Design a protein around this ligand. Structure first.
Ligand SMILES: Cc1ccccc1-n1c(=O)c2c(C)c(C(=O)C3=C(O)CCCC3=O)ccc2n(C)c1=O
Ligand SMILES: Cc1ccccc1-n1c(=O)c2c(C)c(C(=O)C3=C(O)CCCC3=O)ccc2n(C)c1=O
Ligand SMILES: [Co+2]
Ligand SMILES: [Co+2]
Lengths: 380, 385
């Protein structure tokens, strides 16, 4: 029973801005690793002297990589919410980490001011990019910012489109959820739920969890916090140790055939692509046949077996998922490849949709994987 | 050749690029250059000081190194760094100033302590006093042009470097890169640094005047294995020099490009250009067709019909020395700044069974493509008709 209490029309994820020291290398690696070609650029090739921005896109998922180069007349920046000192500061503290999570908004001025009184500390007050585009940014958590942008039409003013025949598309379709790790969960969760109006979500390894979501449950913002005192310390705390503060832990990418796409992503893992986490032991998939065998026939399960895809269930669907290694240098930011199978409905006027968060987020895999690891460790 | 080297400049060992994200730069280079990950030294190896990845393609060894966010004091003998010359502050100031640019050019020497001593005794500025990394490995570092370092490495032999866990990725393919041909620097002013370098390294000089170019001089060791060309801009020369705009965007002197030798530059380029769409290395716009009809009248006696034809599809430049032909192609700048770029070449000929009887290959066989500054100039004007 979501309240639909969102204080601004948050439609969907617009773009995710990463900040590095060389936006060509990171975007270059993410291009073949994810299978999303270069779609837009704001560099010296476009008259931009302040920063080099490049955008990979695979349908609706749009990664943005922004690095700096300038002076006073460097008003040529496409993004006005950009600072060279902050960009170099960010690249030294966290390596390749997410700086902005941009959402689509009815109007840039409203959602900012709807949050400026709801408790959001401002980061970039609204600005008119010209011709229907407006940009706004609030602080969210840590140094990553929540960005508001409103509207064929280009990505942003100052971005020229990129054409390529390679058309390297690995079937990736949409951003699903953007998870962030913070020291204490309660204050930042009340802060984000307070200034957005977003609600919680209904559907130990060492993580205390909470998931924010909009009315349509399409803009998912899960939050994380560690649990101290464990013999082996939580992966959230070691993140906060190596990230140097709170940040975006991972980002989920939704596909409609994540098996065939993983076959393409793993093909590039040997040549500089995304090396994936070690596949679960064989007896883990003996479980998924008992758990999800009614939804997944063997051939669909066996495609998950070699590729190492994980399987977790809620009542209204099953969630295929697989995690990458830390894509950057430090054990910090990584990527989650998922596909959700279940919970359809033609309730929205007859236009069908899938209720967001279908299948959960794989929280049950902490239990079934650790047990299958111990069950396999005994058999050797 | 004078044979006046103060130390045994055996060969290129590696080129170290200092960046703020080694995993991304090494990952993109491995895909674009076809050099699989052959070694790594980071947190997974016990190295809490820096993350380092070694990209390897035969002898081509690119080393990408990025610091971690930690800040250990000067009091903290018991360090965990694989490369002891690495400092966290100089790596961040290097990434903030120059972006993605190489920081060290490593020459394999007979002995590191002796290479350092012979260098500093001839006026070399010390960068890192000699050490013994363990086993038989020895390290030494002296400056050449700016923040770039002429690192000395000494294994008389074992991995790439001690503390580096070798990586063997099954299915890892290779395009055909074999050798570092030359590492070129772009220096404020040529005469001082060329006299400075040649002084402490004992290198000698090495040898079509063009209008849209620069000034240059190439240094080389005894066997001409390692080539250290140096560039200087021309001022008051109308169009913006492609060397000064480097110094303006790079923030001082640095390494302009690196030539990578190949047995089959054609087959290697055909695989590299297949990656340019998916985040690979974008190459310069191909020369107009008048160029490749002109290379037939200049190098038709030395290249087959099919060989000249395939240089045209892949956009490879052709130049001729009296001794051999040089097929070369250049990438668009690999970083965000039009700074560091890469050069893919193959040299043809210039081999003799000197001394023992091995085939050998004369260094600089074909030159460095000096005749293409002029040849490409006319081809644009002829095409702009
Ligand atoms: C624990 C661990 C160590 C080394 C590498 C990987 C892991 N690791 C995960 O990171 C992991 C994650 C990150 C999720 C996950 O996506 C998730 C959400 O999206 C938000 C709610 C909290 C949460 O955990 C689910 C299962 C996971 N599992 C099962 C796992 O093993
Ligand atoms: C200058 C320039 C601007 C925009 C795109 C392309 C170019 N460009 C080059 O960069 C270029 C280079 C860099 C070399 C080259 O490698 C070389 C050496 O390695 C050592 C001595 C200096 C030198 O010329 C040769 C020919 C070149 N040619 C023909 C060319 O057009
Ligand atoms: Co998730
Ligand atoms: Co060259």
């Amino acid at each position: 029973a979501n309240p639909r209490s969102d204080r601004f029309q948050a439609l969907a994820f617009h773009h995710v801005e990463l900040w590095c020291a060389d936006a060509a290398s990171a975007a270059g690696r993410f291009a073949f690793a994810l299978g999303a070609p270069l779609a837009a650029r704001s560099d010296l090739s476009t008259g931009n002297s302040a920063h080099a921005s490049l955008l990979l896109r695979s349908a609706s998922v749009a990664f943005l990589f922004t690095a700096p180069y300038g002076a006073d007349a460097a008003t040529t920046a496409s993004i006005p919410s950009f600072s060279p000192g902050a960009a170099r500061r960010f690249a030294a503290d966290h390596g390749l980490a997410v700086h902005a999570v941009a959402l689509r908004v009815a109007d840039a001025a409203d959602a900012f001011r709807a949050s400026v009184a709801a408790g959001a500390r401002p980061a970039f007050q609204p600005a008119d990019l010209g011709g229907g585009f407006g940009l706004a940014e609030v602080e969210l958590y840590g140094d990553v910012v929540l960005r508001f942008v409103s509207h064929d039409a280009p990505f942003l003013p100052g971005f020229e489109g990129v054409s390529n025949p390679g058309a390297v598309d690995y079937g990736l379709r949409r951003f699903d959820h953007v998870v962030g790790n913070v020291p204490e969960l309660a204050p930042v969760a009340a802060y984000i739920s307070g200034f957005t109006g977003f609600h919680e979500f209904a559907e130990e390894s060492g993580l205390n969890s909470v998931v924010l979501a909009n009315n349509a449950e399409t803009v998912l913002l899960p939050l994380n916090e560690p649990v101290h005192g464990t013999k082996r310390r939580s992966q959230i705390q070691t993140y906060l140790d190596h990230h140097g503060g709170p940040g975006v832990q991972h980002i989920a990418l939704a596909s409609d055939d994540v098996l065939g796409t993983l076959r393409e992503m793993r093909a590039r893992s040997a040549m500089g692509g995304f090396e994936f986490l070690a596949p679960p032991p064989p007896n883990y998939y003996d479980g998924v046949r008992r758990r999800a065998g009614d939804v997944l026939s063997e051939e669909q399960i066996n495609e998950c077996q070699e590729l190492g895809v994980l399987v977790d269930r809620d009542d209204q669907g099953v969630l295929l998922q697989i995690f990458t290694k830390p894509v950057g240098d430090r054990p910090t930011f990584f990527l989650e490849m998922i596909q959700r199978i279940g919970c359809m409905e033609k309730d929205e006027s007859g236009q069908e949709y899938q209720k967001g968060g279908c299948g959960g987020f794989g929280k049950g895999n902490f239990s079934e994987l650790f047990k299958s690891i111990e069950e396999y460790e005994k058999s050797l």
